[PDB]
Assembly symmetry: D2
């Protein structure tokens, strides 16, 4: 392909410590025709707060995806009590054509922001 | 005064105004692991939605508040990223309290927040 | 209500209103310098109710200063930014009500504005 | 680990894309209150800005990152609320570090986070 290897990427940040959130469980699902959620993939954010090798352009077909982020375990391990059980992000993909995605989440015990930076890989 | 324990405040980051008539729907977790409806409603003119529950009815358990942020953005002729915004939390496990969910929406982003008010005694 | 300018601050770590946060509001003078406009600290509710009036709140640029540094330090948390500042032009397109909101964490903060309208 | 001492990244919450061509001016406070110009540039196609300063030049002191967010929106035909966005922090006091100021933008809102990390050794 071109420059990048993976179409779906997730980046998580820590607002309390101002550092990448490492070892955050991430699990993706895909709403199958019946409306059911098929286990698409699952990884753990590396030392850079990023998660690579989730899927390939061929496996990442069109449809509605669900990205779950176990933010609860993250905070517990630290000694903090968080409000949310987990951060979930639901979006439709490759509907426009076939592009690259980036999900970014910012963590805080009682709040979190998620942002998508969708980019056309061919322009 | 906080009559109800659950109140949802929504805003719009691209217009500097409260997000009105946004679809909010709370689900609660069942003993077998299901999600039975708990409340429903749409945000008023001030972005706020209250009277969803009552202390009596809003008891311990895992809750899931869902906002139809998508059909909100589309009414403005904008094609958003998210299908919806969803906040899941374990309510009143530490005893009876009052919770405020605050959302700040944008076509490709959103932040949510919890303000756990402690009851007067 | 009668309050044109209002500021609401929230703590994202504790998950409660940000109390005792010093706020100083400045107005830009025709001279081109910032003249002290208003001042106060967040109440229990996290908001600052009653900064100015619909009379004294004339049109022009306004600088809002939030002292998050002192806020986080009292709690023994060394924060990042020296403070959080918000600058905007007010009323150059109508006499409306401004609400500056702020959600705080040690290494990150967020601000948003709600410009309402004097209805009836 | 971050290679560049101080890097700035800007995003557009509306288009869900990098905020390109945003002007960034950095200043350092002088021993007498003054605000001398330190470095400037504009965000590339990636939304991030590279080449602000080396470690030798990035001494201990207060610094302010000014982003002309107003111009970005006007060029798009939108009228923003803020005049600009400033992030004012103290750098290299607890030791020499590598920073990254990130800002998410919207016509009426902006959030900004910092990512400090100990330089490669
Ligand atoms: C503006 C605003 C916000 C707010 C501000 C920012 Br910045 C955010 O990122 C988020 Br998310 C929510 O939260 C509230 C919570 C309770 C309440 O009673 C009123 C408000 C309110 O008025
Ligand atoms: C998306 C994004 C964000 C980000 C996401 C959300 Br949601 C926010 O509310 C804020 Br504030 C910042 O921060 C970064 C910080 C350092 C870096 O190297 C890259 C990034 C990045 O790519």
């Amino acid at each position: 392909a071109g420059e990048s290897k993976c179409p779906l990427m997730v980046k998580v940040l820590d607002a309390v410590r101002g550092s990448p959130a490492v070892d955050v469980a991430v699990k993706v699902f895909k709403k199958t025709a019946d409306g059911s959620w098929e286990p698409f993939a699952s990884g753990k954010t590396a030392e850079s707060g990023e998660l690579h090798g989730l899927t390939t352009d061929e496996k990442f077909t069109e449809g509605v995806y669900r990205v779950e982020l176990d933010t609860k375990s993250y905070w517990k391990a630290l000694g903090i009590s968080p409000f949310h059980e987990y951060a979930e992000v639901v979006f439709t993909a490759n509907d426009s054509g076939h592009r690259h995605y980036t999900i970014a989440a910012l963590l805080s015990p009682y709040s979190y922001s998620t942002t998508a930076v969708v980019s056309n890989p061919q322009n």
